[PDB]
């Protein structure tokens, strides 16, 4: 009878808390220097970005056209240290931290912050400890096949770039949170998504799951992909439920 | 022995940090007033300005004027280089007394200036006279 | 030949207003002059004591008079040089000014000459 908590997630009090953010983590804009050669930057500082599991690197590059210094916020890779030189471009060496086009890197290399399409400045393999693996090349069509952290294989333009190495901060989810307070603090610096009340504990007006004299769903929890926004709760378009016993 | 008279070195500490100097005399054994291995040097404080073929003679002289300085510097504060400067006319002018009486220090500064002026005009030691950017 | 990727709009000649007539037939007389600044002196017991002690006159002053216009109005109306002006808006919504006169003049004679004692 009322719109459900899922439907109210359109904005308002569910926005991301971005007061303490240390910059948007992006690659350099694909310019002439980075397309035909390489450009060197210095890692000024590695910092913690609240709401993010991976540390950020403040790499300072020289502007190739004007007398000033450009500072780029990168997703730090393991091994990055202050004062390390980072080379970005086609002729960059295959060293951890460098940025190269995926077409210039051999099969089986470990890369992160990969561009989906050359020029979007990083899309794939950015969470802490995640990476993308170069599976193969197709020179004739100028494409590169990569393996994503989810295991899905994707075809990307051979000019897409990616930072060599794995993202720093790996193993973050390996340690249990141990208490609701740690979950409380972890999610302050993120959106308003915690704590999560179950729909069975609500009323028929509050949720499709709510109601009854017992806490039961009352209907199959796998809903069609075509269901209305208010109906789309539970397991949406589930192809297979249950454990793999 | 790499700190010898006539060797170009860099001052790394003091007011004249990063200035190129020539080893005028080495007292590495030490002294009563300086118990360390010091070496008296003569260098440039105000490097001559860059000159252009389009410039007139008055400005060419005006920019080519160079302001020298004489200083006794510790070995640890000196950075020796491979470059060597031929210190003609500049062999015997510095002594402990030359520092004690500033009138000899003032005379030494003037002689060092006129030697640096002539050497700059002669076009020798281009690296010595160009400022070091850091 | 352009060495900058941006196109900034060019500067054009901006003629100044040269009207064919005046929008107002006659300019208004100064609407806040000396006589409208000073309404009347205050002659309460506290005002009298300020006269005899601090060499300070107390005036009922127009709301939109600042310390500068009060000083000139007093100088023009009374030919006395004030050394300080302190103003307050009384709880009834009227400005009151404490005009401290110079050491060369006394507020007593100024008060008698005005005639409000």
């Amino acid at each position: 009878g009322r719109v459900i908590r899922a439907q109210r997630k359109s904005g308002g009090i569910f926005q991301a808390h971005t007061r303490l953010r240390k910059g948007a983590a992006q690659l350099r804009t694909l310019d002439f220097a980075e397309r035909h050669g390489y450009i060197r930057g210095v890692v000024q500082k590695i910092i913690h970005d609240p709401g993010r599991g991976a540390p950020l690197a403040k790499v300072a590059f020289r502007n190739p056209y004007h007398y000033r210094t450009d500072v780029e916020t990168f997703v730090a890779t393991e091994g990055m240290y202050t004062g390390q030189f980072v080379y970005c471009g086609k002729n960059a060496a295959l060293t951890v931290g460098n940025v190269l086009p995926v077409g210039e890197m051999p099969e089986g290399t470990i890369i992160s912050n990969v561009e989906e399409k050359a020029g979007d400045r990083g899309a794939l393999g950015r969470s802490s400890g995640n990476y993308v693996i170069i599976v193969g090349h197709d020179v004739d069509t100028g494409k590169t096949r990569v393996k994503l952290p989810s295991g899905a294989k994707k075809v990307v333009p051979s000019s897409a770039r990616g930072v060599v190495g794995i993202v720093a901060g790996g193993g973050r989810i390996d340690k249990p949170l141990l208490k609701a307070g740690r979950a409380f603090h972890k999610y302050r610096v993120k959106r308003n998504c915690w704590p999560r009340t179950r729909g069975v504990a609500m009323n028929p007006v509050d949720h499709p799951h709510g109601g009854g004299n017992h806490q039961h769903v009352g209907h199959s929890t796998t809903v069609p992909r075509q269901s209305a926004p208010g109906q789309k709760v539970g397991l949406i378009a589930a192809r297979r439920t249950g454990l793999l016993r | 022995k790499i700190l010898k008279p006539g060797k170009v070195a860099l001052i790394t500490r003091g007011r004249f940090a990063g200035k190129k100097v020539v080893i005028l005399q080495a007292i590495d054994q030490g002294s009563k007033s300086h118990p360390f291995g010091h070496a008296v040097v003569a260098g440039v404080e105000r490097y001559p300005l860059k000159v252009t073929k389009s410039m007139g003679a008055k400005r060419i002289a005006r920019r080519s004027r160079v302001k020298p300085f004489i200083k006794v510097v510790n070995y640890n504060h000196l950075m020796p280089t491979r470059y060597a400067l031929e210190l003609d006319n500049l062999k015997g002018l510095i002594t402990a007394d030359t520092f004690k009486e500033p009138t000899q220090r003032s005379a030494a500064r003037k002689t060092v200036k006129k030697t640096f002026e002539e050497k700059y005009q002669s076009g020798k030691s281009a690296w010595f006279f160009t400022p070091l950017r850091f | 030949v352009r060495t900058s990727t941006t196109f900034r709009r060019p500067k054009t000649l901006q003629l100044s207003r040269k009207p064919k007539y005046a929008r107002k037939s006659v300019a208004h007389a100064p609407r806040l002059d000396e006589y409208k600044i000073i309404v009347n002196p205050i002659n309460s017991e506290s005002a009298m004591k300020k006269i005899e002690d601090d060499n300070t006159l107390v005036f009922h002053v127009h709301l939109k008079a600042n310390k500068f216009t009060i000083k000139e109005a007093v100088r023009k109306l009374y030919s006395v040089e004030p050394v300080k002006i302190n103003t307050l808006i009384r709880p009834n919504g009227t400005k009151k000014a404490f005009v401290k006169l110079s050491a060369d003049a006394d507020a007593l004679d100024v008060a008698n000459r005005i005639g409000f004692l």
Binding site: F32, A33, H36, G37, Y38, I39, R40, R62, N63, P64, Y65, H66, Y67, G89 | V51, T52, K53, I60, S64, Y120, Q121, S122, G123, A126 | V1, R2, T3, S4, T5, T6, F7
Partner: peptide, 30 residues
């Protein structure tokens, strides 16, 4: 020939000295 007139050539390669002012007419946001 004044010896003080020394040549200071600028390399304009990638990562070298700042790029000189060139004709960017075809890239102007008109």
């Amino acid at each position: 020939k004044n010896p003080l007139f020394v040549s200071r050539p600028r390399s304009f390669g990638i990562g070298q000295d700042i790029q000189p002012k060139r004709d960017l007419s075809r890239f102007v946001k008109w």
